[PDB]
């Protein structure tokens, strides 16, 4: 037992990290097969970032201008291209450590692990959720750009995120591995509105089931509710509306604990209306939303 | 910016995990050089766990009874020995993936990453603190025994913990890599008292400095205190007494933020006496104690 914000083992991703330098800018790249993926802003200078003309900036660059180092070995760049906000540098050597992988575009509310990297070297790993407003609340300093988010299904790494920037509010924005930003963000040093965020209701419910599985049951009550009544409370407290698809995904957890999803919704309703009353749930004094129902099942069963 | 409960990249440890089977019991082992380290309770049966006579149980075992598999390859066991609560199985092959490593016995209040493993395969990674009462609040199911805790200094992995058991209270107990339990715990299915735990004061203070560095400053006040006055509040709220060694270790963070350690102690004093008043600090509604001053500096600087 016990419930922790667990990240995937980062080994398969560590083996893909490289350092990419262009002129005087250095960030992280992801070396998979014979391609190195990195944020296209690696081609900018400090004066370029207000509104870079990336097509023009990339034209002044040749394959030899992109310095790619994997640890101590230098990769030979034989091709370069921009796809959306990422640069794809073709190298003459396939990464011997390339795991089985996929590029996926995650949905808001889904989770993933981030391997924070600086100068091509891994510093740490943490579990993130893609917020409903398409930002992530990460830990990223200067040089962390090009660090990636991923999930691992047995031996397959599904890369879902690449870090590009920090908004003036301290939240993080980035792209999928095809270079498309999540949310309305653009890769320029401009003030950008992150949309109104909401709490991931299905995840808070999944976490309440994890709490019941692990012994924390104080919040369980003698009440039930309906999807419509619960959604009136969710709207008031800036929670995502709960749908039947969300109820269906909570099926396994409802089955294991024997607590109907709507009864758990009534517990959540009372927690939203009354607060925690100085108590904790799974060591937290607030309602956690960065564990999906899948994460809860995986952690509570022992999937490797 | 941003502050997260970050674990070390687990790659160097993943490469050491093996599955150890003895009779019908299977748990995880750590393969370093030509030695596989695992909890000695791998030699027990269900009827043995009330009070195992490990010396007698190990005598009925031969090298061929210890089945060690690293992924799909079978290791050949050429020696076996018990050192405290760990078994050391000498194998005929040095692990090609053995990183630079040390065995260290961590101090209470210090942190480390745990690579939870099942059947020799890594499931996830999380950051833990060794509680002042020598337990850890982990996430460990049946089969997780033999999973290890570690820190990484550049290329050197300092292994500090091996998981052995879950106390009836849901907290976790284990040993250093020489097989000595942290705390008064013994490897038997007996009800065992975990000592009175306390909050790691120096870590909560280190985390308050991380909050100030990252923008959360609401808790800063116009007050100061003394070590003696603060310690009267710490005693009341079951916080570890703050010493000059702790003040000294907070030196760098005090220097960076320009907030004297005793002024931060007065902020902590007011937070202890008044609570959070429905507010949060670094996304938490309680006082976090599982980040050391070293962890804060590392995360806030970008050490890889
Ligand atoms: C991710 C990272 O380390 N950095 C944040 C982005 N910086 C450039 C930038 C500025 C404004 C908007 C965007 Cl999309 C990108 C990085 C600059 C260094 C020199 C790599 C730092
Ligand atoms: C760590 C783990 O997976 N397990 C917890 C300990 N179990 C045996 C046990 C019982 C009582 C006290 C101690 Cl020190 C150890 C493990 C049993 C399986 C069969 C490995 C499970």
UniProtKB/Swiss-Prot annotation, chains A, B:
- The highest taxon in the source lineage is Viruses
Known consequence of changing residue 145 to A?
Answer: Complete loss of 3C-like proteinase nsp5 cleavage
Q: Which residues does the entry assign to the active site, renumbered to this chain? A: 41, 145
Q: Where is this cross-link: Glycyl lysine isopeptide (Lys-Gly) (interchain with G-Cter in ubiquitin)?
A: 5, 90
Which chemical reaction does it catalyze? TSAVLQ-|-SGFRK-NH2 and SGVTFQ-|-GKFKK the two peptides corresponding to the two self-cleavage sites of the SARS 3C-like proteinase are the two most reactive peptide substrates. The enzyme exhibits a strong preference for substrates containing Gln at P1 position and Leu at P2 position
Main function: Cleaves the C-terminus of replicase polyprotein at 11 sites. Recognizes substrates containing the core sequence [ILMVF]-Q-|-[SGACN]. Cleaves and inactivates human TRMT1, preventing tRNA guanine(26)-dimethylation of tRNAs. May cleave human NLRP1 in lung epithelial cells, thereby activating the NLRP1 inflammasome pathway. May cleave human GSDMD, triggering alternative GSDME-mediated epithelial cell death upon activation of the NLRP1 inflammasome, which may enhance the release interleukins 1B, 6, 16 and 18. Also able to bind an ADP-ribose-1''-phosphate (ADRP).
Q: Which residues of the full protein are shown?
A: 3264 to 3567 of 7096
Domain Peptidase C30 as annotated: residue spans: 1-304
Effect ascribed to mutating residue 142 to A: Does not affect ability to cleave and inactivate human TRMT1
- Describe how its activity is regulated: Inhibited by pyridone-containing alpha-ketoamides compounds 13a and 13b. In turn, alpha-ketoamide 13b (tert-butyl (1-((S)-1-(((S)-4-(benzylamino)-3,4-dioxo-1-((S)-2-oxopyrrolidin-3-yl)butan-2-yl)amino)-3-cyclopropyl-1-oxopropan-2-yl)-2-oxo-1,2-dihydropyridin-3-yl)carbamate) inhibits SARS-CoV-2 replication in human lung cells. Inhibited ex vivo by michael acceptor inhibitor N3. Inhibited ex vivo by compound 11a and 11b.
Name of the protein in question: 3C-like proteinase nsp5
The source organism is Severe acute respiratory syndrome coronavirus 2
Subcellular location(s) per record: Host cytoplasm; Host Golgi apparatus; Host nucleus
Quaternary state and interactors: 3CL-PRO exists as monomer and homodimer. Only the homodimer shows catalytic activity. Interacts with host FBXO22; this interaction promotes the proteasomal degradation of nsp5.
* Ranges in the topological domain labelled Cytoplasmic: 1-304
């Amino acid at each position: 037992s016990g419930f922790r914000k667990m990240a995937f083992p980062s080994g398969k991703v560590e083996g893909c990290m490289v350092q990419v330098t262009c002129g005087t800018t250095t960030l992280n790249g992801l070396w998979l097969d014979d391609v190195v993926y990195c944020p296209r802003h690696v081609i900018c200078t400090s004066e370029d970032m207000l509104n870079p003309n990336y097509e023009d900036l990339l034209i002044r660059k040749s394959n030899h201008n992109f310095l790619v180092q994997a640890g101590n070995v230098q990769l030979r760049v034989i091709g370069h291209s921009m796809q959306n906000c990422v640069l794809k540098l073709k190298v003459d050597t396939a990464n011997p450590k390339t795991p089985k992988y996929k590029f996926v575009r995650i949905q808001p509310g889904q989770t993933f692990s981030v391997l924070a990297c600086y100068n091509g070297s891994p510093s740490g790993v943490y579990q993130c959720a893609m917020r409903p407003n398409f930002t992530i609340k990460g830990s990223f300093l200067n040089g962390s750009c090009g660090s990636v988010g991923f999930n691992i299904d047995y031996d397959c790494v599904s890369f879902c995120y690449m870090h590009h920037m920090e908004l003036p509010t301290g939240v993080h924005a980035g792209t999928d591995l095809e270079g498309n930003f999540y949310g309305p963000f653009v890769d320029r040093q401009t003030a950008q509105a992150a949309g109104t965020d909401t709490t991931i209701t299905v995840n808070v419910l999944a976490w309440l089931y994890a709490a019941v599985i692990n012994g924390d049951r104080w919040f369980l009550n003698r009440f039930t509710t309906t999807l419509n009544d619960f959604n009136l409370v969710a709207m008031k407290y800036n929670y995502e509306p709960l749908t039947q698809d969300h109820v269906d995904i909570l099926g396994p957890l409802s089955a294991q604990t024997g607590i109907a999803v709507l009864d758990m919704c009534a517990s959540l309703k009372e927690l939203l209306q009354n607060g925690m009353n100085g108590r904790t749930i799974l060591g937290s004094a607030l309602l956690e939303d960065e564990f999906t129902p899948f994460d809860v099942v995986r952690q509570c069963s022992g999937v490797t």
